[PDB]
Design a protein around this ligand. Structure first.
Ligand code: HEM
Ligand SMILES: *[C@@H]1O[C@H](CO)[C@@H](O[C@@H]2O[C@H](CO)[C@@H](O)[C@H](O)[C@H]2NC(C)=O)[C@H](O)[C@H]1NC(C)=O
Ligand SMILES: *[C@H]1O[C@H](CO)[C@@H](O)[C@H](O)[C@@H]1O
Ligand SMILES: [Ca+2]
Ligand SMILES: [Ca+2]
Length: 336
C-alpha cells in the first residue's frame, strides 16, 4: 500500500526505516548478506535478550525482565557479565551503532537482525518481523539464561517460566543448526554443533542423537560431551535434551523434515520475539524480510554412521528413514 522513498513497497510506513537498516546490516554486519558468525552471534543475542523475562520473579514481587526489550544492548554493561553472555560484546557494539544510526529501538533491531540474518542462511523460514517495541529497558535480572550445564529439568523450568513448553524449547533449538561454540572449548574455536552450520536444516537434531564417540579437542571444555565425529562439538544440554523423555519425541520429529522444523521454529521465534510486549501493539513489517535461498540438500546421517548409531530416544515412534552417506566420518571445519 505504501511506498517508501526507495520505491520499496510495504504495508505500513513504519516499515520504511527498516529498509535502510536492511541494507546496512546486509552490507556491513552481515558482510554481504552472508550466513556466518554474525548471524550466529545475533541468534544468541536474540535469545538472551528475550529470555530475560520471568513471570515467576514478577509474581515474587520483583522485576522479572522486559523480554525482547534490547536490554542486552542498552544494559550490556550488566548483561554481558552474565555467564551465558560471553563472546557477544563485539556483536552487541555493532548492533548498538546500527540502532543509534538508524534510530530504531534496540529490541526491534535485535529481532530485525535475527530475521535478516536467518534470511541469509539457506533453508531458513521467513521469520516474522514486528516493529514498535519501546527502546526503554531495565537490565535483565541475572540467572535467567539457560546454561549448557543445566539439567533438562532446570532448562524446561526456566524456559517454561518465560512461557515456552518443552516442545517449544526443542523448536527454538533449531537455531543450533546454525551454530558453533567459541567460549566452551578455546582449543576448537567455532567447532560447529552440526555438520551444516551454514544451512538451517535438521542436521543438528540428527547428529545430537548419534552416539558420542569423539572428543573433538585435546581436552573437554565447559559442558562438553563426546560428539559423533571430529570437529563437531556437543554441549551437554543438547545431548540431554535429545534424549530426555520430555523432549525426545519432539527432537526426533525434527529430524526428517526441514519444512516442519522451519514452521515450528518460526512460530517459536515469533513467540519469543514479543516476550514483554503485546504483539497486537506492534506493526507487522515482515515483508521487509526476504525469503532465504532454499536448501535442496536432504537430511542425512553423516559419515557412514547408520540408524544403529542413533540413540533413539522417543520410545513410541520409529526413527525416521534418513539417508546415510559413505564413510569415513567427516571432520567438520570450523564454522566460518
Ligand atoms: C535451550 C537452551 C540453550 C542452551 C543451554 C544454549 C547454549 C549455548 C551455548 C553454551 C553456546 C555456545 C556459545 C559459545 O561458546 O560460543 C550456544 C551457541 C549458540 N546458540 Fe544456544 N543455547 C540454547 C538455546 C538457544 C536458542 C533458543 C537459540 C536461538 C534461537 C540459540 C542460538 C545459538 C546459536 C546460533 C549459537 C551459535 C553461536 C556461534 O556460532 O557463535 N541457542 N548455545
Ligand atoms: C535507545 O536507548 C539507548 C539508551 O539506553 C540510547 O543509546 C544511547 O544513544 C546515545 C545517543 O546516541 C549514545 O551517546 C549512547 O552511547 C547510547 N547508549 C547506549 C547504552 O547504547 C539510544 O540512542 C536509544 N535509541 C533511540 C532510537 O532512541
Ligand atoms: C578434522 O578436520 C577439520 C578441518 O578440516 C578440523 O576442524 C577438525 O578439528 C578435525 O581436525
Ligand atoms: Ca532483554
Ligand atoms: Ca545445520
Amino acid at each position: 500500500s505504501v511506498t517508501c522513498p526507495g520505491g520499496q513497497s510495504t504495508s505500513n510506513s513504519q516499515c520504511c526505516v527498516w529498509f535502510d537498516v536492511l541494507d546496512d546490516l546486509q552490507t556491513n554486519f552481515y558482510q554481504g548478506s552472508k550466513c556466518e558468525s554474525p548471524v550466529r552471534k545475533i541468534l544468541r543475542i536474540v535469545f538472551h535478550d528475550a529470555i530475560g523475562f520471568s513471570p515467576a520473579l514478577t509474581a515474587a514481587g520483583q522485576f522479572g525482565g522486559g523480554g525482547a526489550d534490547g536490554s542486552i544492548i542498552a544494559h550490556s554493561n550488566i548483561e554481558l557479565a552474565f555467564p551465558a553472555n560471553g563472546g557477544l560484546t563485539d556483536t552487541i557494539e555493532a548492533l548498538r551503532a546500527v540502532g543509534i544510526n538508524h534510530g530504531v529501538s534496540f529490541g526491534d533491531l535485535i529481532q530485525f537482525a535475527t530475521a535478516v540474518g536467518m534470511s541469509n542462511c539457506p533453508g531458513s523460514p521467513r521469520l516474522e518481523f514486528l516493529t514498535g517495541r519501546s527502546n526503554s529497558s531495565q537490565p535483565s535480572p541475572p540467572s535467567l539464561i539457560p546454561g549448557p550445564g543445566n539439567t533438562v529439568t532446570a532448562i524446561l523450568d526456566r524456559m517454561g517460566d518465560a512461557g515456552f513448553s518443552p516442545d517449544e524449547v526443542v523448536d527454538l533449538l533449531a537455531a543450533h543448526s546454525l551454530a558453533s561454540q567459541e567460549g566452551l572449548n578455546s582449543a576448537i574455536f567455532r567447532s560447529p554443533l552440526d555438520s551444516t552450520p551454514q544451512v538451517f536444516d535438521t542436521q543438528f537434531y540428527i547428529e545430537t542423537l548419534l552416539k558420542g564417540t569423539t572428543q573433538p579437542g585435546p581436552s573437554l571444555g565447559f559442558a562438553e560431551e563426546l560428539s559423533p565425529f571430529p570437529g563437531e562439538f556437543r554441549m551437554r544440554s543438547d545431548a540431554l535434551l535429545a534424549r530426555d523423555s520430555r523432549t525426545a519425541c519432539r527432537w526426533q520429529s525434527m529430524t526428517s523434515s526441514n519444512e516442519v522444523m522451519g514452521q515450528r521454529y518460526r512460530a517459536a521465534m515469533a513467540k519469543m520475539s514479543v516476550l514483554g510486549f503485546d504483539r497486537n501493539a506492534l506493526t507487522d513489517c515482515s515483508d521487509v524480510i526476504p525469503s532465504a535461498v532454499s536448501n535442496n540438500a536432504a537430511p542425512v546421517i553423516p559419515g557412514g554412521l547408520t540408524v544403529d548409531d542413533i540413540e533413539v530416544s522417543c520410545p513410541s515412534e520409529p526413527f525416521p528413514e534418513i539417508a546415510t552417506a559413505s564413510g569415513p566420518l567427516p571432520s567438520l571445519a570450523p564454522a566460518p
